[PDB]
Amino acid sequence: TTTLAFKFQHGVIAAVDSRASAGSYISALRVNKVIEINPYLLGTMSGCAADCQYWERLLAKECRLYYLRNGERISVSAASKLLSNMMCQYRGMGLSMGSMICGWDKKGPGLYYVDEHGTRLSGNMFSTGSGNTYAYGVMDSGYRPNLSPEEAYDLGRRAIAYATHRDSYSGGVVNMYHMKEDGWVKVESTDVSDLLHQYREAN
Amino acid sequence: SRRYDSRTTIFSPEGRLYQVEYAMEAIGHAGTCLGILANDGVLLAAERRNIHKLLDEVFFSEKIYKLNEDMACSVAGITSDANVLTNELRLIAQRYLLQYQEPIPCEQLVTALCDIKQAYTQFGGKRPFGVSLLYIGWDKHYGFQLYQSDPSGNYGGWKATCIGNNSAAAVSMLKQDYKEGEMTLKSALALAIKVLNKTMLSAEKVEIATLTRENGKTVIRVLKQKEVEQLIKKHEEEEAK
Amino acid sequence: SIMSYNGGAVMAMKGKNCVAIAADRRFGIQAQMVTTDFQKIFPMGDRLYIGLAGLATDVQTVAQRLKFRLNLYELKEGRQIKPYTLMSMVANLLYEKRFGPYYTEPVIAGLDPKTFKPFICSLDLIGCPMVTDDFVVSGTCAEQMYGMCESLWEPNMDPDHLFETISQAMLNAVDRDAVSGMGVIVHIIEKDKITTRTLKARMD
Amino acid sequence: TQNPMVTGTSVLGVKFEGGVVIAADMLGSYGSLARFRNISRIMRVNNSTMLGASGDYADFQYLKQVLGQMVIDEELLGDGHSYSPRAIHSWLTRAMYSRRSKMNPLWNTMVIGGYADGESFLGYVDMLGVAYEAPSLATGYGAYLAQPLLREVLEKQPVLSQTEARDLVERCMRVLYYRDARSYNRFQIATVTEKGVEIEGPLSTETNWDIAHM
Amino acid sequence: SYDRAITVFSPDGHLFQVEYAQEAVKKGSTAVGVRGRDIVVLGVEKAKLQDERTVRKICALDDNVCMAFAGLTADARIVINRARVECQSHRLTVEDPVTVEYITRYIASLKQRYTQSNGRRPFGISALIVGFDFDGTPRLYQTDPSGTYHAWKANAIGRGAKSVREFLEKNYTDEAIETDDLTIKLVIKALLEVVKNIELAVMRRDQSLKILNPEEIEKYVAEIEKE
Amino acid sequence: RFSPYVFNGGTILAIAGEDFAIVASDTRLSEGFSIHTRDSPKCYKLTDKTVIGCSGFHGDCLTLTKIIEARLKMYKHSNNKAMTTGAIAAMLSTILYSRRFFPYYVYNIIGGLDEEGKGAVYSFDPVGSYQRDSFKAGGSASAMLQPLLDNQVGFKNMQNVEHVPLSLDRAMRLVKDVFISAAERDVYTGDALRICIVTKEGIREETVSLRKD
Amino acid sequence: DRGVNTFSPEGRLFQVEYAIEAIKLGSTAIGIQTSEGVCLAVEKRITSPLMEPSSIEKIVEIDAHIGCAMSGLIADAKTLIDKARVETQNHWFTYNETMTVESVTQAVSNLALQFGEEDADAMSRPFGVALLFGGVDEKGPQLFHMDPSGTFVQCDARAIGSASEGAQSSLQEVYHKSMTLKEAIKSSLIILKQVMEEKLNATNIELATVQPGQNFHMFTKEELEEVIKD
Amino acid sequence: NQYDNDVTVWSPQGRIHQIEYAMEAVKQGSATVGLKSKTHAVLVALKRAQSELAAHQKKILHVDNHIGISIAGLTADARLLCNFMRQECLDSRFVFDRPLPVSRLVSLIGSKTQIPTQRYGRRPYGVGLLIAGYDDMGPHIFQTCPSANYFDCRAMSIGARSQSARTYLERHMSEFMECNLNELVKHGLRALRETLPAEQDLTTKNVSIGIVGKDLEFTIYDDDDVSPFLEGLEER
Amino acid sequence: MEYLIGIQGPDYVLVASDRVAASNIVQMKDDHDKMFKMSEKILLLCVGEAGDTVQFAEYIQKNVQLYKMRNGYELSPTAAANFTRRNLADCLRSRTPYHVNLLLAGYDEHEGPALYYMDYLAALAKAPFAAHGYGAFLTLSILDRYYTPTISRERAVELLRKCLEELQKRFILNLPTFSVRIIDKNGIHDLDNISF
Numbered sequence A: 001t002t003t004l005a006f007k008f009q010h011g012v013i014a015a016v017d018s019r020a021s022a023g024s025y026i027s028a029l030r031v032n033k034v035i036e037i038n039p040y041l042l043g044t045m046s047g048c049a050a051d052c053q054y055w056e057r058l059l060a061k062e063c064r065l066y067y068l069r070n071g072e073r074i075s076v077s078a079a080s081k082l083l084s085n086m087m088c089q090y091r092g093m094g095l096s097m098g099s100m101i102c103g104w105d106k107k108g109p110g111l112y113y114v115d116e117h118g119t120r121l122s123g124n125m126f127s128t129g130s131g132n133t134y135a136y137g138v139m140d141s142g143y144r145p146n147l148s149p150e151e152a153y154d155l156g157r158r159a160i161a162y163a164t165h166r167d168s169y170s171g172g173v174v175n176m177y178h179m180k181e182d183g184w185v186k187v188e189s190t191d192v193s194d195l196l197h198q199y200r201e202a203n
Numbered sequence B: 001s002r003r004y005d006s007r008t009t010i011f012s013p014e015g016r017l018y019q020v021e022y023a024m025e026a027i028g029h030a031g032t033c034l035g036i037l038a039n040d041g042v043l044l045a046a047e048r049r050n051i052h053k054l055l056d057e058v059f060f061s062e063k064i065y066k067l068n069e070d071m072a073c074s075v076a077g078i079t080s081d082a083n084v085l086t087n088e089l090r091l092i093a094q095r096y097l098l099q100y101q102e103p104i105p106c107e108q109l110v111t112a113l114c115d116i117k118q119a120y121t122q123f124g125g126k127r128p129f130g131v132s133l134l135y136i137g138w139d140k141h142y143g144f145q146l147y148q149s150d151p152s153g154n155y156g157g158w159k160a161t162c163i164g165n166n167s168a169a170a171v172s173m174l175k176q177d178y179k180e181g182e183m184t185l186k187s188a189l190a191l192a193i194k195v196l197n198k199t200m201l202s203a204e205k206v207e208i209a210t211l212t213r214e215n216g217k218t219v220i221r222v223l224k225q226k227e228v229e230q231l232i233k234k235h236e237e238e239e240a241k
Numbered sequence C: 001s002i003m004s005y006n007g008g009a010v011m012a013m014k015g016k017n018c019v020a021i022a023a024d025r026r027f028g029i030q031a032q033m034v035t036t037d038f039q040k041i042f043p044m045g046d047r048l049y050i051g052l053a054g055l056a057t058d059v060q061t062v063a064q065r066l067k068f069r070l071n072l073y074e075l076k077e078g079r080q081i082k083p084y085t086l087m088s089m090v091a092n093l094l095y096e097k098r099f100g101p102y103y104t105e106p107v108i109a110g111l112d113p114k115t116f117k118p119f120i121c122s123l124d125l126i127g128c129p130m131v132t133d134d135f136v137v138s139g140t141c142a143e144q145m146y147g148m149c150e151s152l153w154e155p156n157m158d159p160d161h162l163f164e165t166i167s168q169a170m171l172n173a174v175d176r177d178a179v180s181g182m183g184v185i186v187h188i189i190e191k192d193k194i195t196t197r198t199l200k201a202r203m204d
Numbered sequence D: 001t002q003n004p005m006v007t008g009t010s011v012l013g014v015k016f017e018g019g020v021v022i023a024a025d026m027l028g029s030y031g032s033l034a035r036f037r038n039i040s041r042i043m044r045v046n047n048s049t050m051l052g053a054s055g056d057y058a059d060f061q062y063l064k065q066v067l068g069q070m071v072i073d074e075e076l077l078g079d080g081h082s083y084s085p086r087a088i089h090s091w092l093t094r095a096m097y098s099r100r101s102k103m104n105p106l107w108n109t110m111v112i113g114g115y116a117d118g119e120s121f122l123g124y125v126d127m128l129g130v131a132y133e134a135p136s137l138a139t140g141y142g143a144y145l146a147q148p149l150l151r152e153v154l155e156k157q158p159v160l161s162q163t164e165a166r167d168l169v170e171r172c173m174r175v176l177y178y179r180d181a182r183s184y185n186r187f188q189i190a191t192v193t194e195k196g197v198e199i200e201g202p203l204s205t206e207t208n209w210d211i212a213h214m
Numbered sequence E: 001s002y003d004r005a006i007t008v009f010s011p012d013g014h015l016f017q018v019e020y021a022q023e024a025v026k027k028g029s030t031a032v033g034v035r036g037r038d039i040v041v042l043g044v045e046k047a048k049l050q051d052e053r054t055v056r057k058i059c060a061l062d063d064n065v066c067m068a069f070a071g072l073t074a075d076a077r078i079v080i081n082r083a084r085v086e087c088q089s090h091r092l093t094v095e096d097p098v099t100v101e102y103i104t105r106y107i108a109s110l111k112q113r114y115t116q117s118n119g120r121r122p123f124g125i126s127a128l129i130v131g132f133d134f135d136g137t138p139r140l141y142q143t144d145p146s147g148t149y150h151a152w153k154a155n156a157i158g159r160g161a162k163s164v165r166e167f168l169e170k171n172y173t174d175e176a177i178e179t180d181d182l183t184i185k186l187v188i189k190a191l192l193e194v195v196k197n198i199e200l201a202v203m204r205r206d207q208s209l210k211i212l213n214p215e216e217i218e219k220y221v222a223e224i225e226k227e
Numbered sequence F: 001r002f003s004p005y006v007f008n009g010g011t012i013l014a015i016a017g018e019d020f021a022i023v024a025s026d027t028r029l030s031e032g033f034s035i036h037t038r039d040s041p042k043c044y045k046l047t048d049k050t051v052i053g054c055s056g057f058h059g060d061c062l063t064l065t066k067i068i069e070a071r072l073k074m075y076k077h078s079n080n081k082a083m084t085t086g087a088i089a090a091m092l093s094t095i096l097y098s099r100r101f102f103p104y105y106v107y108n109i110i111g112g113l114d115e116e117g118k119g120a121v122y123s124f125d126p127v128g129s130y131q132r133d134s135f136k137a138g139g140s141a142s143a144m145l146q147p148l149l150d151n152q153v154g155f156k157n158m159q160n161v162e163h164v165p166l167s168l169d170r171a172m173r174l175v176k177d178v179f180i181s182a183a184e185r186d187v188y189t190g191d192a193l194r195i196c197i198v199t200k201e202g203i204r205e206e207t208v209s210l211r212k213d
Numbered sequence G: 001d002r003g004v005n006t007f008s009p010e011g012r013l014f015q016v017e018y019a020i021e022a023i024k025l026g027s028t029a030i031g032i033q034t035s036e037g038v039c040l041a042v043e044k045r046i047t048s049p050l051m052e053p054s055s056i057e058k059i060v061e062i063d064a065h066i067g068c069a070m071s072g073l074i075a076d077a078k079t080l081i082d083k084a085r086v087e088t089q090n091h092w093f094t095y096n097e098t099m100t101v102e103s104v105t106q107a108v109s110n111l112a113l114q115f116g117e118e119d120a121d122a123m124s125r126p127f128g129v130a131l132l133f134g135g136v137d138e139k140g141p142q143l144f145h146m147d148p149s150g151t152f153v154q155c156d157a158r159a160i161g162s163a164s165e166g167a168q169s170s171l172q173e174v175y176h177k178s179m180t181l182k183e184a185i186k187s188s189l190i191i192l193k194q195v196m197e198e199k200l201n202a203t204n205i206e207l208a209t210v211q212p213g214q215n216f217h218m219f220t221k222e223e224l225e226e227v228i229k230d
Numbered sequence H: 001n002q003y004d005n006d007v008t009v010w011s012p013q014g015r016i017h018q019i020e021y022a023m024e025a026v027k028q029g030s031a032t033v034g035l036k037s038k039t040h041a042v043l044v045a046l047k048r049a050q051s052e053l054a055a056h057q058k059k060i061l062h063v064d065n066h067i068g069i070s071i072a073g074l075t076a077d078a079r080l081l082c083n084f085m086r087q088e089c090l091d092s093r094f095v096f097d098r099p100l101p102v103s104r105l106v107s108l109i110g111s112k113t114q115i116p117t118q119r120y121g122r123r124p125y126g127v128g129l130l131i132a133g134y135d136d137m138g139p140h141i142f143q144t145c146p147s148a149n150y151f152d153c154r155a156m157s158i159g160a161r162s163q164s165a166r167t168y169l170e171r172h173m174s175e176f177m178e179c180n181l182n183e184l185v186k187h188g189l190r191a192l193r194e195t196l197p198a199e200q201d202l203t204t205k206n207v208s209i210g211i212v213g214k215d216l217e218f219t220i221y222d223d224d225d226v227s228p229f230l231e232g233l234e235e236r
Numbered sequence I: 001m002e003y004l005i006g007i008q009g010p011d012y013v014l015v016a017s018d019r020v021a022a023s024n025i026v027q028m029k030d031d032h033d034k035m036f037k038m039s040e041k042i043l044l045l046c047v048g049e050a051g052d053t054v055q056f057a058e059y060i061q062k063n064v065q066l067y068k069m070r071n072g073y074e075l076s077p078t079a080a081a082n083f084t085r086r087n088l089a090d091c092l093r094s095r096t097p098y099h100v101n102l103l104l105a106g107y108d109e110h111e112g113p114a115l116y117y118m119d120y121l122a123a124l125a126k127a128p129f130a131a132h133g134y135g136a137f138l139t140l141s142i143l144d145r146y147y148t149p150t151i152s153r154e155r156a157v158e159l160l161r162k163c164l165e166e167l168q169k170r171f172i173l174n175l176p177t178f179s180v181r182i183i184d185k186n187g188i189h190d191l192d193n194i195s196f
């Protein structure tokens, strides 16, 4: 897997890989590694597939239940803190889940990295998965806080694209979202080899 | 089963908890017990009800109980109930000490027991504890302190207070002779005997204890019968003059 | 070993009408020294002291859980505890954890309420009481301590003789132990007074 | 039971026209030792069903106790309903799977034979809850020696008479006695037809050792 | 365990133990709460030999919320402490400070439960919960032995709550809200209709809960007689 | 040490079409180098529009199957309606994850119709992660059949090719040819191919033969 | 005294009988089920100008397609409302779908006779509340009534509370199965105006409408003013 | 006077008044009729409406593919008993892979409902059921009551005015075994309509039917699905 | 792997901690704060295993805050250090032990400045100066050399810079920036971050 997310002038970009593997076999060429919790709250997934699906669906259920109770949406800080507390209860159980809780609330854009250990970090740039190092390299090189929405879509597209090239546990398609003030918009679902071929053909 | 239930934890039509109110009546029948706060210390003066000639007098007190290194207390009510509560007070003080490695601040020890007393009024179906307590102490936050708590689990801080027999008369008498801020253990001890004399006077029928600060350490001491005799004759002299 | 993770040494010695208790002052984790003033001897009465060697958490925990029971005991009983009775209190506290014990080997040094008869003892980590009429040792340098004590100890030692003996037996033993040292503290417990001394010891 | 003690080897089974026949030697082995050479490893469950068991004997005896009581329990009601062979097989699958899931298996591999409403029944259940029906079964080492002979005949002629089925089982027991080093020349043949369950024993297959003179 | 139904329905549809718990609230000292724009104020009515500090009826629940009570003081202490625990347990779980509605909904839920669970009698207290939310919005809520809760511009509970409510209904104006000292004067004037016999505390938006000293109280009391 | 698992083999495969869904399996059941039975189809009818393929440890296959069967009845009693294909898939994920620490060693592939009457396939891993698919293979010969499904049914690696969607006739011919190849190379696949076809009209079953060895 | 699970000589539990009497003391609420959606309306019964009208929430959202109207002991209702919201989200989690209005009504209904003293874990008495569940599902717009006996029924029009007898009589004379949601809202407001002691206004009552394709909506004061204008 | 309060109290007459009071709940629910032929078991019940605007309450519920019930009494207790029955049935198919024999299910109801008749602070079930089933012994009609006693019936009626329905079932009893489904259901409808007032008749709104038999799984007919059966009725 | 340092003066406590939130070979965050304010005059600096640290530190924080609300006054650095120890030591033999190594700095109105060292085993030591992590091996001797008990805050800040400069010269782990704070009679004061 290769997931990435970065804050910038126009919001938060969140891009994911789509490969699921069992040993060296590719179990799924395309898998959705982004849970759309609500119009303003997403979650990226990496690690154990069952842990990712069940645990993030449990955060979504608790987020939905919060809205019914208070009549307000949950904040990015409460949703990320909620997930890390669930992970904390199952410490030493062998869960594997790397996620980034991305959204927009009363305090602007929000991006948190949550781990199966109960790690909870707020930051403006993260990357998770077996190919995170490759994604960090490309992302760091071209990142400036004043990037255009289209310039940021290229940075997020290329960062995942180059990580699928070197990481055998990453491939398939890039699913990219742009988190704006009035909710997210799913930017694209683009084949990574078609992108890599486009960059090769440009040499 | 429903037939035999006393219903001890329920409200009466006027919002009253009858077992709590009947518990207080028990305390009115117990021996008079008063506490007076001073600038240099704090005291406890109680009437002795074990006043028979064939009593052994093995213990250092009858109604006065040391709880902590810095705290002591006296009781008015069912003495067996008071033994339970004082023993629990000693355990709460040691649980605090084990955890923070500092002695429990006075008001906190009183609140903790009062939360157990309150629980007996709200749930369980058991009768309450028929005891009122007067607590004396010293802590690094409020210095010399004097508390009082009744069977309801309600408490308060006082400069002078009385529980037990003729408590009402003693509080009106303390109200007149208490000079807030200008009191010392010497003048307050005179006042303690002055009050107990009217609300009841051999040194066998009385029992006094003081809490003071000597060399940065708290000193709790129940006064000897001779000491109490000298305090009674110093008042007997002033009463004749 | 678990007991060697923190190190340290404790020792007690009898006297004609006095008792001595000593310990090193190192607090270190494995090969690294953290502090040079760690307390290992705790007063339990006017003339009664307990010394704890072994794992620093359990030295602190046992001393605190023991002080809790002691305070309650003296409040219910209206008397200061007898030295033998404190030993039985520690044995029962330690034996409660028989199948998952505290990593501490106590040493008790005190005087009988007959304001005289010296008492010394030691307990293993599972609370086995052992009273001796000479000396008791507990630490990572127990072999060194036994050698020094066996050679130096004499029967009716005066407080001054007891001081020189327990001081020399601690200093020379812990100077052959890598994880013990950083100073030595000694308490001389007489009917009339307690004398506490820190010795000028090696700092390596 | 994490480690079996006295164990039984193969249990054979084959359905014929009008019933089912099941076979098992009467041996309980403690490793290589033929410790009990005369214990029955077959049980009549009720009028339509019969069970044979491989693996641990103490666990088989326990199941024989639990089943035996269930049957007694049912019969007290007398409501015109009784456990079909298929229902005993279903219960026994749930029983083995349940013990396996608590990591405390009953160390057995059993064969259930039955005859209800003109239909022959033959079902396999092992210590893990693996169950299935087949025209012929063979547990343990019998799955390697006897199952190929049962299937060889059932390939030529799928419907066998009670006599053909019986001779096929005697031929299989002779092979098992020659090849299985945990077998014994003492066995039982149990048969379930319209009439009900009939257990026959002790039987022995005649042996030929002329190959010794070759 | 003691599994006796204490609070049950009477033939006319009443929950008699809750109405008896209301009768205990009615006998407590008068607690008044007035909600302003920049400050939310709480005031309570008041022996010469007693320590005033140990008998305060205005309690800080957290940094952003506090409350006052009327009724059984020992019952109130148990509610106040269970709310204090829930404030911190809410910070541990979602890392977000409790909203004035959250802890009111919490206290109300606790109160309701004691009217419907075995072996327990209801809490003989009402509470006036004031505070400023994280977005700086001023709030004032009120709970009762039954478990019901509502928000108020101003409210009163305890011995003489009906006459103070009648005064506050006719005197709560936008003019009185305008000055922060005018909001404080409304509370003191409302309490003066029933009453060193007042306890007054103020919570100004981001600043801490300020319990006004007797001299400071007398500063406002002097201007009330003048106007 | 006792192991609560055993591998009994078998191959399952499903294809989602415009107005149909096929769920297919071999009938072999084995253990080690032995064949338990040659008539053990891995297809289980759940509703008139939902079929499931199950493969792996047979003990877990039988159990998860009876639990699914019981849960549908419970849902029908509670909601007075049959579970849709999507509700069965979402539920199976929770049942599988209920055994996250002692898994059901089962590969599940649900196949049926969605609420628009179109073909729906949901594929799962033993621990409960699932997704909707156009097609999928599971079980012992999973890795042999999946690349051919990707090619012939997904049109992958083919440029200048007309993307004609698969018909029931054409998909049935492909299922029959892939199980023949699976039976040639995978020792655990064989004896017969059981095919379940789900359409508006209901479920039909077809049984073609595969190699006996 | 007698146990909370004592039957009257007529065959009804005394505690349930008395819980129904408690509903006769609560605010009057109306529900009307129409082909175009379900309408819910309730009188707040405000007792002081100092009380915030917004702080009285007698119409709640259970989920996007389901709303609830309540009467009786308002605090007893808050527990069952939360039980209903939790239920819908546990069903969404397990089955990836919404519940039918009836399924939600049945779920809340199962908690009704779950009270007792001896042999319990632990409600002492029943809930003194009546509920109206108005929502939309595949069966169309549905409105359900429930009382403390756990008995739930589907209603075309229903009124609960103090003036239940009178409001239902008025509903009966004006309800037709083909009546528009505009006419449903008007009738409910006219019938609510008739039964209340205080005058009706946009800050005195609550109104909510659930319609297919629009979801659950709580009418604003500006919207309530426009409705009261007609 | 004093023997009314608890189920554990025996009256000086050897009677338990709480059990008798719980049975009054059944007699106050609307009429239900159950009857059987050689191949089928039918449940026919009258559904009351709480107003013209309210719907007619569900009197017939599903238990399994071979068992269905009709209730009379406390609807919450009927749901409690229904879910116990549904679950007992599920357990039998899970464990044995065969339908739970109807008489065995009914014994479990009698065993389950007797427990609170002998325990302090507990109360009997305020529900009476008519059970329709089919198994290896053909079709069955059973009757359960708030007293944990149960009965095997050829036909039966419980509830308000059920005496009138019982009389029709006793008089036509002989014709039931050789009856076809249309005729057996019509017999049930006639017994149900005898309870109904003189001014009131059966309706495609107040009638509910449940059928289980040799080839048919338990099926519930309610409004237009009920119409074919009512189209045969002809008199009084 | 992480770095904590404390230097106690006559009337203040100076503390510093690295700002790296790392996972595997990557430096995920350069601006990560490891100090948790317990009271107005108490800081708990906490280092250790992935989840354990925030979980343990925040539980202690919330309980120290509950004490302030419950009693009207705060815990002393001594009572707050011993309370931290009681909880850590109580989890030691439990199913869920915390792998946290921490430092508690604070200022008491009666006892003055106090700095405490706590093992992951929950041994509590009062020290004039302390350090946690591999960095402590390279800096405890620099502190041994130059530390004096009368060290002014301006001088302690210089001594702290020498310890942090030593980690740049010899430590293999990339610890670029550090949080710096002083606790005194007037509370917790944030100082400029020591950066490289």
Ligand SMILES: *[B]([O])([O])[C]([C]C1=[C][C]=[C]C([C][C])=[C]1)[N]C(=O)[C]([C]C1=[C][C]=[C][C]=[C]1)[N]C(=O)C1=N[C]=[C]N=[C]1
Pocket (backbone or CB within 6 Å): A001, A002, A019, A020, A021, A022, A027, A031, A032, A033, A045, A046, A047, A048, A049, A050, A052, A053, A129, A130, A169, A170, F125, F126, F129
């Ligand atoms: B990724 O490589 O970390 C990926 C994450 C993933 C996979 C599927 C679905 C989701 C969210 C719905 C997320 N994980 C896998 O590929 C893992 C193996 C893995 C784990 C950690 C590092 C590298 C690879 N695969 C599975 O969990 C899995 N594979 C097959 C079947 N079921 C599960």
